[PDB]
Amino acid sequence: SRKTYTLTDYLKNTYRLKLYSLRWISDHEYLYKQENNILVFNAEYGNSSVFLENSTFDEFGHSINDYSISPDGQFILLEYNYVKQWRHSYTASYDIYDLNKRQLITEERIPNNTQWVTWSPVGHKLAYVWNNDIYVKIEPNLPSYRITWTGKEDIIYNGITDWVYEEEVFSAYSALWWSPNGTFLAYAQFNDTEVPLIEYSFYSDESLQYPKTVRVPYPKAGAVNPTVKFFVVNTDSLSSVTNATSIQITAPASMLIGDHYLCDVTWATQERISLQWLRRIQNYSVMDICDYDESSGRWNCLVARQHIEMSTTGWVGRFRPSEPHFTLDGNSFYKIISNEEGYRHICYFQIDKKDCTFITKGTWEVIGIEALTSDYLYYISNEYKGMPGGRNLYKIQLSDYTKVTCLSCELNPERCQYYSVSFSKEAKYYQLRCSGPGLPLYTLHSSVNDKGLRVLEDNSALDKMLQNVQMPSKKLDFIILNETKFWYQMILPPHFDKSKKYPLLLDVYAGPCSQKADTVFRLNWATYLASTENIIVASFDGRGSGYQGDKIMHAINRRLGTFEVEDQIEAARQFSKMGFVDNKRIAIWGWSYGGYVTSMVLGSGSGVFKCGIAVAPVSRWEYYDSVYTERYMGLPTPEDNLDHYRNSTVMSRAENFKQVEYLLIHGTADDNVHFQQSAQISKALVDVGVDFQAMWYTDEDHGIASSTAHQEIYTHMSHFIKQCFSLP
Amino acid sequence: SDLSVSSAGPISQFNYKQSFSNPTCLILATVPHNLTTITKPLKYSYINKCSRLLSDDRTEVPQLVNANQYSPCVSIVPSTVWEDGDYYRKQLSPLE
């Protein structure tokens, strides 16, 4: 009987979740930012002592976008003048502050408009990229050494990624990898020479007279891809007398015969490196293990240290092949692999033996390998209570695979079912982050005897606040189709009367290996819709979804816009059968792949849905990028899968839209899913006389994430929903 | 370092291997301005991988050059390599 969670609450952020992010700097010490000062805490006991006062950079005379303290705490890097590029990427200005000297380093600075900077992982070495060339600083205040002379805008990329590698392979702008003690610096070089440009307008500030045409090399399904080459430089033997020597490590022969990608870079020991390559047909990948050769100065990659990974029913890995975690000697390694039942479990490999041995089994999956000591492997999975939507930390005894113990399931069972972990430098201590179903809880533990020394943050203040608002409840459950469990979640309005009939809004993503039904606690506009508009908001994970094995995940192989669409419809039906849903009032909405699925549903003719909103939807797979799209579809040639490409487009369903209300929204500057896709949607709809609502957002990207634009889009969608449900 | 009887890098592997059964020599020198009649190429090239992929599309088998011979990859490597990482492929006939 209090006040509700309102749209203004959501947009103005009035009820905020506290976090606690630390950074381990040793085996028993981490850094936190309490009251804008950086403090160093000592886990072994309790003490805490100031590492850097907030006042230190009162004198900088620059808005400070980001900082990064070197591994040895001697130097701090200061990032200012951030100017955004894509997603994960930018340009900035950098200053280095000597913590001993308590002085800014003014001689030999890092050039303006730098693309990326990393410290070496142990000293205070620096690698940065500027105009697409790599530069190394050994001592922070002496001339950088130029590693590459070959970089060229939009063509050659040394040490940073091009659009497609950034978005779809590495999930980062960086393409540098230091060896553990910073001796070697491994890097990739991308070549976009023959890759087609996507072009689009940028309007900018009202005073720019002629719009800017932005050009990005971007391969669409089937188009010419970038090429990759791999190098390693020895940073200890750099010199100003002599251009650095980068040794090129060449891909395996099974890759050289055709288009390929470099999909993983992992260091095994101070002198051993592992590279994973993937064929453009993502059926087939090879791991190469290369040793450094103290005499010749090169890198030896013995065949029969190679390890082939094939998929007979889809692609390798969940999104890419998984990364290996080597033992300390680097002669054996652990790696998540899909087993005979098609469930992803931990595999134990010898670098010279083709076969591997599974150390876990079961109808549940390993999410990630988190830490590896000599005695124990620490990993996260969804085994607990057979819920694919939960996460917990487990540790498995390396001498007895039967001795696996669960470090988080009993910590706080009714409140915490979604854990992620951050380990100290030798897995001595670890922090546990709990994400739901209750409010997030952050604790600290020592792994010696698993004791929970400290509660870092519990969101008491937030709990207090939420007592005095009518919050919605969340149900998480499953239904059974064809002898298989498919989970869903529902956000249910306050005072939920099982007898009344509520309007329903399907929240959809449904992309391959996705998962919208989980145990995470959230405060978002579904909260607003449930709390204030008495509207049930639902998500469902049908065919081709994650973390339940390959029977479900690979179900949509070679055929997007089929099974997952069907299943989202089926879930609206199944929701009707439950009897508290007013079936004259089911909307559906989704962004990106979810916009694609929303559109496909609205055009299905099913007659189940009254209206939908599609934000930045894919409309036709030949429009999306090669890496992502071909992973699930192969090439759009008629020797391959062209039929399923063409059968599966939004525009070909245009007629059916005559039965539904449709809102179509897209940012004009979306470099990911191009405005093109929606331009094509609205064009087909016009061409068959269908009315619909639309909205462009000038200059927004795929995120539509800028403040004003974000409150605007949610307000607009709110009005469309409230109107479509004929609610006040 | 990579041009020596004892070496086991890409030079003796894939480029130039001399006899181990006859007395042998290896001289490294520079052409100073004095003589002018010898002319530079664009850049120093060498082969860094030369392999077969057998028909199983799995197995890689390096092809080592024999003493007094040319690498089997001469047929597919340009006289001067264009850029530092370039790679070359020639499909083989079932007989070949």
Helix, strand and coil content of chain A, in percent to the nearest 5, comes to: 20, 35, 45
Q: Tell me the nearest-neighbour CA distance from B34 into chain A, angstroms.
A: 25
Q: DSSP labels for A80-144? A: EEEEE-SSS-EEEEEEEEETTTTEE--SSPPPSSB-EEEE-SSSS-EEEEETTEEEEESSTTS-P
Which tokens go with A21? 């992010």
Which residue do the tokens 């808005």 mark? A63
What stretches of A382-534 adopt beta strand conformation (E)?
A: 392-397, 400-406, 419-423, 429-434, 441-446, 454-457, 469-470, 473-481, 484-492, 502-507
A194 touches chain B (CB under 8 A): no
Please indicate whether residue A28 is annotated as part of the active site: no
User: Could you report how far apart the first and last alpha carbons of chain B are, in Å?
Assistant: 35
Q: Where is chain B broken, named by the residue before each break, C–N > 2.5 Å? A: none
The span from the CA of A330 to the CA of A321, in Å, is 19
The span from the CA of A453 to the CA of A469, in Å, is 33
What stretches of A524-580 adopt beta strand conformation (E)?
A: 536-540
- Cβ burial of A121 (10 Å; 0-12, 13-18, 19+) is middle
With a CB-CB cutoff of 8 Å, which residues 3-22 of chain B face chain A? 7-10
Q: Tell me the nearest-neighbour CA distance from A486 into chain B, angstroms.
A: 38
Cβ neighbours of residue A182 closer than 8 Å, sequence gap 6 or more: A120, A121, A122, A123, A125, A235
Strands A260-269 and A272-279: antiparallel
Of the residues A531, A592, A619, A718, only one is catalytic, namely A592
β-partners of residue A128 are A117, A135
Nearest one of A389, A582, A591, A376 to A474, comparing CA atoms: A389
Give the nearest chain B residue to A229 (CA atoms).
B85
A252 touches chain B (CB under 8 A): yes
Give the nearest chain A residue to B10 (CA atoms).
A298
The span from the CA of A437 to the CA of A494, in Å, is 17
- Residue A603 phi, psi (nearest 5): -85, 5
The upper half-sphere exposure of residue A506, i.e. CA atoms within 13 Å in the direction of its Cβ, equals: 38
Nearest one of A563, A560, A566 to A592, comparing CA atoms: A560
Beta-carbon separation of A257 and B85 below 8 A = no
SS3 state of residue A687: helix
The span from the CA of A629 to the CA of A651, in Å, is 18
The span from the CA of A681 to the CA of A656, in Å, is 13
Please indicate whether residue A374 is annotated as part of the active site: no
Q: Tell me the nearest-neighbour CA distance from B45 into chain A, angstroms.
A: 13
A254 touches chain B (CB under 8 A): yes
Which residue do the tokens 């089929």 mark? A562
Please indicate whether residue A295 is annotated as part of the active site: no
B96 touches chain A (CB under 8 A): no
Size of interface A-B (CB pairs under 8 A): 46
B90 touches chain A (CB under 8 A): no
- Which chain B residues are closer than 8 Å to A308 by Cβ? 58
Q: How does A36-69 read in b/e, with b if 16+ C-beta sit within 10 Å?
A: eebbbbebeeeeeeebbeeeebeeeeeeeeeeeb
SS3 state of residue A643: helix
Run of H or E residues at A42? strand A38-42
SS3 state of residue A309: strand
Distances (CA, A) of A150 to A134, A157, A318: 10, 8, 34
| Backbone conformation region of residue A328, classed left if phi is above 0, alpha if psi is from -120 to 50, else beta | alpha
User: Three-state SS string across B47-88, please?
Assistant: CCCCEEECCCCCCEEECCCCCCCCCCCCCCCCCCCCCCCCCC
Beta-carbon separation of B53 and A306 below 8 A = no
The span from the CA of B60 to the CA of B56, in Å, is 10
User: Could you report how far apart the first and last alpha carbons of chain A are, in Å?
Assistant: 19
- Residue A111 phi, psi (nearest 5): -55, 150
The span from the CA of A618 to the CA of A543, in Å, is 19
SS3 state of residue B18: coil
Beta-carbon separation of A254 and B58 below 8 A = yes
Cβ neighbours of residue A685 closer than 8 Å, sequence gap 6 or more: A654, A657, A662, A692
Hey, how many other C-beta atoms are within 10 angstroms of the C-beta on A170? 18
The span from the CA of B96 to the CA of B88, in Å, is 17
A253 touches chain B (CB under 8 A): yes
What is the stated resolution of the deposited model, in angstroms? 3.9
Give, as one character, the DSSP assignment of residue A472.
Answer: P
Q: Are A519 and A439 in contact (CB under 8 A)?
A: no
B72 touches chain A (CB under 8 A): no
The span from the CA of A80 to the CA of A62, in Å, is 7
Of the residues A670, A671, A674, A678, only one is catalytic, namely A670
The span from the CA of A653 to the CA of A664, in Å, is 15
Which tokens go with A371? 């830490």
- Which chain B residues are closer than 8 Å to A297 by Cβ? 1
The span from the CA of A404 to the CA of A726, in Å, is 54
Hey, how many other C-beta atoms are within 10 angstroms of the C-beta on A210? 6
Which residue do the tokens 């669960």 mark? A406
Q: Are A494 and A683 in contact (CB under 8 A)?
A: no
Beta-carbon separation of B85 and A252 below 8 A = no
The span from the CA of A539 to the CA of A532, in Å, is 19
Q: Tell me the nearest-neighbour CA distance from A241 into chain B, angstroms.
A: 19
SS3 state of residue A484: strand
Which tokens go with A282? 């993502």
Q: Are B2 and B10 in contact (CB under 8 A)?
A: yes
Q: Tell me the nearest-neighbour CA distance from A366 into chain B, angstroms.
A: 28
The span from the CA of A224 to the CA of A201, in Å, is 23
Q: Are A381 and A365 in contact (CB under 8 A)?
A: yes
A243 touches chain B (CB under 8 A): no
